């Protein structure tokens, strides 16, 4: 009974390392993508400035 | 045809195409940062419904 209970508790509480590592990598690439997008977007008011004159 | 000071139709054309390009740029930036092609129903209504149900 203890072996089966430990197995069931692992199914519910213990983490899946493959899925979690995949999710972590996906989150990291998403963070870099948002970094690049934000860096590009921080330059539109520069285009506004170059028009003034 | 004449050379005027009060109206600048070429300026209006440039402003219109500039706003169009800016809107396209903002849409592309939103899709790139979000990672989703459909971030509102105006992108694709049936696509949004299908993606939500899936």
Q: How far is A17 from chain B (nearest CA, A)?
A: 24
Please provide residue B39's backbone torsions phi and psi, each rounded to the nearest 5 degrees. Answer: -110, -10
DSSP B1-54: ----SS--HHHHHHHHHHHHHHHHHHHHHHHHHH--S-SSTTT-HHHHHHHHH-
**CB-CB contact of B10 with B4 (8 Å):** no
Please provide residue B10's backbone torsions phi and psi, each rounded to the nearest 5 degrees. Answer: -60, -40
Q: Is B27 on the interface with A (CB under 8 A)?
A: no
Judging contacts by C-beta atoms under 8 Å, the chain A residues touching residue B35 are 30, 33
Nearest neighbour of B35 by CB, restricted to A33, A36, A44: A33
**CB-CB contact of A41 with B30 (8 Å):** no
């Amino acid at each position: 009974i203890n072996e089966n209970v430990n197995a069931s508790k692992s199914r519910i509480k213990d983490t899946d390392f493959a899925k979690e590592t995949t999710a972590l990598t996906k989150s990291q690439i998403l963070s870099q993508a948002s970094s690049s997008v934000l860096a590009q977007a921080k330059q539109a008011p520069n285009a506004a400035l170059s028009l003034l004159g | 045809m004449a050379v005027n000071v009060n109206t600048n139709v070429a300026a209006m054309t440039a402003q219109r195409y500039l706003t169009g390009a800016t809107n396209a740029q903002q849409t592309s930036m939103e899709r790139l940062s979000s990672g989703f092609k459909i971030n509102s129903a105006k992108d694709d209504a049936a696509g949004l419904q299908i993606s939500n149900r899936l």
